[PDB]
Structure formats: structure tokens, C-alpha cells
Amino acid sequence: LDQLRQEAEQLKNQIRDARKACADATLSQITNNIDPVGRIQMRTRRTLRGHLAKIYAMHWGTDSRLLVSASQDGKLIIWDSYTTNKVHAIPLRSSWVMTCAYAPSGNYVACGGLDNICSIYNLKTREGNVRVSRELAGHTGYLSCCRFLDDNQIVTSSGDTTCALWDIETGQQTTTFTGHTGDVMSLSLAPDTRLFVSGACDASAKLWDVREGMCRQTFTGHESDINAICFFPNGNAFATGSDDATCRLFDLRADQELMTYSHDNIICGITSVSFSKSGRLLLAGYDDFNCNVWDALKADRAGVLAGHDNRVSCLGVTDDGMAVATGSWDSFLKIWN
Amino acid sequence: NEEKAQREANKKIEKQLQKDKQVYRATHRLLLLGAGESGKNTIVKQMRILSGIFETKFQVDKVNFHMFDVGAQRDERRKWIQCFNDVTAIIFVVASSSYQTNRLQAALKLFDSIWNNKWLRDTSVILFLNKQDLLAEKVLAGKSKIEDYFPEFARYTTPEDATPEPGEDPRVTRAKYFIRDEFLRISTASGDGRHYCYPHFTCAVDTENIRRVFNDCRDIIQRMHLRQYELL
């Protein structure tokens, strides 16, 4: 075992030296030819009310109009964001929901939490009602994130320190992703849905091949638990938000960190991260009840989404980039433009 | 035509959501947290006779309480403990007789982490010192020797306000109130009238535990109401 530890230390030193060799210039110097975006002044265009407890998660639809939101009062509310009309109000068996997903086809929603079960609910049944299409059990820790791949496959992350890929038709674990040494807090599917990144409470992010089931790359640099993670829209990079009060943008092909979004006045962790349509803006929700829009290339804070009366727990950006939905522990979802 | 149907469905949702709002506000949520040997499961059994989380519904004086026992969750609590920021109370169960070389110090550190957590700074903690009978037997048998695990216990003296049980040895009272004051040292340090600690000398089979939780919850609600009026 001692020789294994020595070889691991040598490999870590070699990896660090290789990443150093691949890094000659910082993102600031390379982005000298791009202008700052200036102040980004979004306003609360809609306020979705009806959740009773803190909202832990939301997910936009592919139509960019219908979105599911999960509150710890035991509700998945499916919202028509245009008219603020509630389309569905699904009562959950377990009120301790920490994540929710909306199927790309729009016919299903997902949720899960402290019950360790990923519940898939149908939205377009023959009778028009909402039923529990399936329950997915097998995680030994709380379900922290879940994202649909399609009507039949779903990827989930858990405090069991592992990620799973489930076939919804049969309710079996198609694949298991293990390697993190802390609760996986969030996952982000790639644009091609072939790879996905997951940040964990071990201050590390990991890139997983969905088909192969192995950890392709491990990204370090954060000093505390990574609560949020999201792919860059181009699919060759991603961003993470951590409890060290910093966000960090990594790129997959270079294996190392590209940028750090931090400020002295920010001493609270990041709960949610989401990129805009172009990826020029990185929206991050914070514990200080605010959301910061960061110039993803210049690492400056380009705007502040203020107005939430409690911790901003969730973020979501429409597939067409029209609006940003922010959930919070004040029971309200704010639609911003 | 579609907008009218959407609005009708929304109103149908709204009435049911108002009903669910009334149901949700009528019920009090409690987080039962404790070590494996603290007797928390015995308390669960006593309350029940009278999966990633276990739910217990019990009503006292026609008031509904929903207690949640964390099971099948790793010992790294720092993330899933934030789910219980808005519960009525966290019932922290301690094995007071367990002074893991020292489980009492582990419970003290866990209580400190819960007390000083930013998301739990507004959540009251009901302290159930659950092993009073075992503590009494251990200290009476003379095998306790608490002073080696806690030197401060040597110079410590029983407080004036302590009310011993009938026929109770003074050393039993001294040790139990010493542990209670060990927890109250953390609780009083920067409590600042936003959340409160309710220490109780309990046993795993005490039928008074449910009433203690009910009374502590009533006190929490009263203090929250008084704070809303800036009276406290």
C-alpha cells in the first residue's frame, strides 16, 4: 500500500506538471481582444408564487415556457412562465425534495431527495392526470441532482458519493459512476449527452463518459464543497460554484482551471450556476440572498439579481436564452430578463 | 380558447394548493437527530406505539407533528442538514452516559456545529440527555471517573437551581447537570434570542418525552410570535 501511495503522489505531481506545461497564458491575457459587457441590469419580469417552503430546485422546459419547480413542502409545481399559470401541482410522497428535472420531450418530470428515490411522473397520460410513472431506488444517499437524457434514460447524482444512469423503462441502473470522495451535489449533461460533469463535496469535479462509465478527467482547485456545476454551451468546458465563495471555469480539453470568479466582499458559497445562451454570462446564486451575473471571460461581476429574501437555491436558463428563473428559500421563483 | 382552459386549470390548482397550504401550516416538522447508541430509535418506537428518511406522524392536543429520522444517509451531515432549517425544532439526542473513546465529546461537537450553523441559527434545538438512568448507575458504581475525560468536572459544583429527583444521589445530579451545562455553554454562547436550546433529562422509555417536545414547540412558536412583535 505504501508503494501505491508513493506512485499516486508521483502521478499527482506529474499531472500537476503537465497541467502547468499546458498553461502558458492566463484567460485574462488571452481575452484582451474582447470588450467587457458592462452592467447587466435584469429585472424580475415574473414572480411565481404558490410554493410554501424553500424551493430547492427548478428545471426549464425545452419550449422555454413550461418549467418544473420543487419545494420542500412536497410540491412539484409545473408553471407556464408566460402567464404565471400553474399547469400542474404534483404532491410528492417525500417532502424533502432537493432536485427536479423536466423531460426534454416535456411528457415527464423527475424529482428526488432525502428519500434516495428518483420519482418520474407522467405529464401526458391517457386520462390527462399525473401519476408516478416510476420510482428509481438504489442510491444509498440523498438524491442531489437528476437530469433526463430522454424519455427512457435518466442520470442522477447522490450523497452516496456516486452517480447513476437509469433505464426508466425497466427501472434498473444502466451504469454506475464512482470516484468522488464526497456527496455529489450536482451534475450537468453535455450538449451531446455523451459525457457529464459532476461536482462533489470533495472539492473536486469529475467528467464521466456515459457509455464507458469511467471517470475521464478530474478537476481540482476549489477549496471547499462544490455545490453547483454546469457545462459551457459549447460542450468543451464547464463551471463550478463552491462553498469557498468562488466560482471557477474549467475546460475539458486542457484538464485545468481557466478562470476564477471571486471577490473580497463575497464570503458566502455558491448554490447554483447557469450559463447564458452564448456562455458570455455566468449566473451564480449565492448564500447572501443575491445572484451574481459574472462576465465569464473577464471574470468581473457584470450584474446583480437582487430581490430574493432568502438563499438563492436554484438557477435555470431557457434553451433559447430569453429568461432566467431563480428559485430561493423564500418560496418564490423569479423570472428575469 | 386555450387561455381560458389554462386559467380554469390554474384556478383548480389554486384551490387545492390553498387546502394544502392550510394542511402544511397546521403541521409542525421536527428533525430527530442523534447517535446510533443515543436511544433515538427507542424514542421513535415509544412515540410510534403511543428508506432515506423515516417519517413519524403524531398528534398532541389535536396538534399535528411530523418528525423525521435520518436513516440511510452518510455521517457527513453538512449538506443534508440544511434541509431542516425551517423545522419547528431539532431534537438532538445525547447518550449522557457515554462520557469512540468519548462519545459525549462527539455529541458536544455535533451540537456546537448545529448551533453555529448559519442555516440552523434560527432553528431551536431540543436537547434530550437520553441516558440519565445509565449515567446514574455508572456514577453510582464508581467506575465513571469522569474527571479524567473532563477535568473541569473536578472543580465543578452542582448549581443552586438544580432540582434533583426524589431519592437521587448528589453525585448523579452533579454529573448530569455538569453535562447539561457543558451543552449550555455552547448554547448560550451567541444565542442572541433567535434560537433556543431546551435541555431535558430524559430516558429512552420516558412517555414524558412527547409532552416535552410539544411544550418546547409551543414555547418556540410563542417566542417566534413575540419576536414578530419585537417583544423578544
Epitope: - | E76, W115, N116
Partner: nanobody
Framework: QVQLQESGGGLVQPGGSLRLSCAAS????????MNWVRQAPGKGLEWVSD????????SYTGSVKGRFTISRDNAKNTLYLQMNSLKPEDTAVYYC?????????????????????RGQGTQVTV
């Protein structure tokens, strides 16, 4: 990557002295409360001592009060545990643990089985 390397542990007679050192890298040392936790053979992880971000606030487990002294050097990003009046029960693996989040007064999980921000430990045999 958060790295905590412990050293200075070695054989010692009862009542002796020993200075355990902890080299910290990959994070801002002054921003995190630090801990020393041991795992004696046949026993789970035991919390011994903690020290605040600046070093003003210090706490010990009762068994080491008046014997061990925790200290931190933020400028050197290092932690120290002076060990005096040693007893055979102190023979354990000593892990230099870090509290999970900076600028916080809670220090969850440093005694957990698979805690991340914890070193590999050093052997102290009395």
C-alpha cells in the same frame, strides 16, 4: 487539491514530548478553523483539539487538557500540536483535519469516516 500532510509522529516513552506538524496546501490556511483528531487502534475517530482561524479561540478534548497545545502559523500555512505528559492511550494515528467551509463557526464532519479535507495522519506510539 486540498492537501494536509502530518509529520513528527514517532516512538516516545510515557510522559515524553513530541511536536506534530501539519503542512497545509491548496487553500487559504488563515480562512479555515483547524482540528486535530486521532484514531486509536480498535476505536473510531476521536476529536482532540480545534483552533480558530486566527488562533484566538482554542478548544481541547478533556483527556489532553493541560498536556497538549494546539497552535497555528498562518504565515507558514502550518499547524502544530505540542505533546507533553504523554500516556500510552495517546498512541494513535493523528489526522490534521480542516473544517469544511471558510468563515464559518460550524465544523461539521471532521471526524467522519470518509472526510475529504483530512490528512493521512501520522503514527504516535507511546
Amino acid at each position: 487539491q486540498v492537501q494536509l500532510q502530518e509529520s513528527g509522529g514517532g516512538l516516545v516513552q510515557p510522559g515524553g514530548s513530541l511536536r506534530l506538524s501539519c503542512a497545509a496546501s491548496g487553500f487559504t490556511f488563515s480562512n479555515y478553523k483547524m482540528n486535530w483528531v486521532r484514531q486509536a487502534p480498535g476505536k473510531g475517530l476521536e476529536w482532540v483539539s480545534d483552533i480558530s482561524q486566527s488562533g484566538a479561540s482554542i478548544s481541547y478534548t478533556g483527556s489532553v487538557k493541560g498536556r497538549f497545545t494546539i497552535s497555528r502559523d498562518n504565515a507558514k500555512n502550518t499547524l502544530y500540536l505540542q505533546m507533553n505528559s504523554l500516556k500510552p492511550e495517546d498512541t494513535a494515528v493523528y489526522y490534521c483535519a480542516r473544517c469544511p467551509a471558510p468563515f464559518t463557526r460550524d465544523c461539521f464532519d471532521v471526524t467522519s469516516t470518509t472526510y475529504a479535507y483530512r490528512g493521512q495522519g501520522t503514527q504516535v506510539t507511546v
